[PDB]
Design a protein around this ligand. Sequence first.
Ligand SMILES: CC(C)=CCC/C(C)=C/CSP(=O)(O)OP(=O)(O)O
Ligand SMILES: [Cl-]
Ligand SMILES: [Mg+2]
Ligand SMILES: [Mg+2]
Ligand SMILES: [Mg+2]
Length: 780
Amino acid sequence: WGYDLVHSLKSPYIDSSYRERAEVLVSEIKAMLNPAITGDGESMITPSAYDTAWVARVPAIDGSARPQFPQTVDWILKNQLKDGSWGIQSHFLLSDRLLATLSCVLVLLKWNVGDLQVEQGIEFIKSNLELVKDETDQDSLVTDFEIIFPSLLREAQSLRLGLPYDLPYIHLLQTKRQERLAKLSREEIYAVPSPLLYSLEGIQDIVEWERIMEVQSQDGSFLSSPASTACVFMHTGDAKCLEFLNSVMIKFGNFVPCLYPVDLLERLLIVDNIVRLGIYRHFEKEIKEALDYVYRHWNERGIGWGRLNPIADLETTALGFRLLRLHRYNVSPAIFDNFKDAFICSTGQFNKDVASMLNLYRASQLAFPGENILDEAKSFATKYLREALEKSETSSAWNNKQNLSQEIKYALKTSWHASVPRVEAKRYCQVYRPDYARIAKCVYKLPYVNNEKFLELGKLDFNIIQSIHQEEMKNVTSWFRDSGLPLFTFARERPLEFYFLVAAGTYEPQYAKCRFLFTKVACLQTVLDDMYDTYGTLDELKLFTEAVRRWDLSFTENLPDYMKLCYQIYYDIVHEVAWEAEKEQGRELVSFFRKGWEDYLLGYYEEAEWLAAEYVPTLDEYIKNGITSIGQRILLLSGVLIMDGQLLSQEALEKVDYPGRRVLTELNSLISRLADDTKTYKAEKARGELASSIECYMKDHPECTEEEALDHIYSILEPAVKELTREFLKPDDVPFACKKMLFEETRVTMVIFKDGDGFGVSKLEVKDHIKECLIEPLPL
Ligand SMILES: CC(C)=CCC/C(C)=C/CSP(=O)(O)OP(=O)(O)O
Ligand SMILES: [Cl-]
Ligand SMILES: [Mg+2]
Ligand SMILES: [Mg+2]
Ligand SMILES: [Mg+2]
């Protein structure tokens, strides 16, 4: 550990060639994304054999005995898979292959073509249906499979095709179809848009075609589905339906996808993946352009996956809420009222429902003060997700291949606030799939979202940043060794731990000085802390505290030897930080730093007076002192004022730092103090130590239990965390890098003190985080 471990690291990724390569990947990605963000190549989505067959059904509008879109028939004839099914070869999903293959077989028969393809398709359907033994054999279901397949299969039956109509699995599907159709509000199909509009081709006996146009989308589609739209067209001759089908053929040539457009969901998925991979700083322009487009379409009624959908989609809306708020757009959680009754969204296909609830769960964590609906949403989504873990569908072959249960479990154990940013990006680089397949009416892919380039850059960029940090850690440990700080054997050496505290969140190459000075101050503080609350006597501390007031090295003659050394190091670190800050900021700051340091150490001294007198403060007194004496304020200032290119006027600084006000540095101090207490108070009790916030509350409330005491401390933390989030994301004219640096240090602090029971900080967890974040590179 420490010096020896760090100087033994020799990362190759520090060489300029690796960053030059990463820059080529960045340019390649910008080019790849340009059509989706700036051009007209939006909605890049794979073919739906199922939907393409429905479009192929449409007869020529001139009344002749041939398809209106003959190119779709040719596509179908040329794209059969080797086993006789139609679908995407890379992924096998039984229900997808069954639906698509039966769909294709029937349209080839309609036009009396493809004898061989039909024969092979029928064989695939028969043989695979006969392999189904029980329900747990069916695997994941494409959207509305239970409704559509029995309908399509009855069409085949009327043609007397050689299919096993009497299989128990087939009877079960008809049973499920009835179960679904029973909850249907039929009169309302015509007045209130609903998810069933996506699949009208499966409920043809139910729909009064003469009434259905009232819920058609503006582009002429029925909920973006080419198949459903084609069906309505064949029954009505509706001109707008035909325009939609034409527009999709024009865009894709000789096939159609199962959803179109997917302009809103695709943009949001692009941004989500770039952010989660940790590569977002290379794509500020593209992310703004994507989110700007989403925001233009953002409205009080929510958003669908496509901007023309006549009903909002929880998946897209929750994802949009989160990314918009995260990028400082003004959104209200009131949009989730669109998904409420008397919450629901427990209808639909399983992966979509799970996705919607994962997105709602994540969105709920970005709550601002007073946003009760998000607390409710968090509770609801958590319950939903824990239930989903217990459902058989979660363990289907398809879901297991994508580690769905693992993903749900990880989401539930992961708090956005209590996250290590660099570590989350590293972990996501290990989960992200370039060939990820999604489910709707058919299995599909979105290549702008899931591709090899994103991951290549993610892994390389992570390794390069890490290698830069490793060189910085050599500098840190080298400075530490020669600094004099190791001479204080009453304190533990933790330079890498403090470097991690800042570097795991504020990682960008240009902020090396920020990280370095932050680390120096944190190393100094840990010695000062031990000196004031443990090692020093009150009379010694009174002397040291007087020296603090005087800012005079000559006055040090009066101090004990160890304090002479401590004062010298402190004095030097304070003024190095101040000089660097004055250089960056172009204004005087020595006086401002000196006052910050005096208030901090005078805080320690008040605390030391209490300890010596065995005085237990009121909780008000304790928190008042603790916000000042915890030391986060002056530590944060020692980093935030020295960020390359980030100018903070006095006016701007006061927006994020102002003792006595609920601004970022104050909220961090408060959260740190109380979070620490929640994590450690029991160890300090059994050690006969200085009272914590818990003990202070119990003195204030002699009748209350320890449990009630801890509960109260949490009732203070939770509101503070919400305020911290709003202060961070709030639109203002404070350089955002500075706000982010403050917030991210808080997030890493919250990781260290998470799950506050008794009981102590986990030294092993800390070491493991440092290993993962700073020591071990990603394999390429
Ligand atoms: C605290 C543990 C588990 C061992 C580290 C020893 C050491 C560096 C003491 C830190 S003093 P601390 O526990 O943070 O209590 P505070 O004065 O910060 O409220
Ligand atoms: Cl996959
Ligand atoms: Mg202390
Ligand atoms: Mg201490
Ligand atoms: Mg403690």
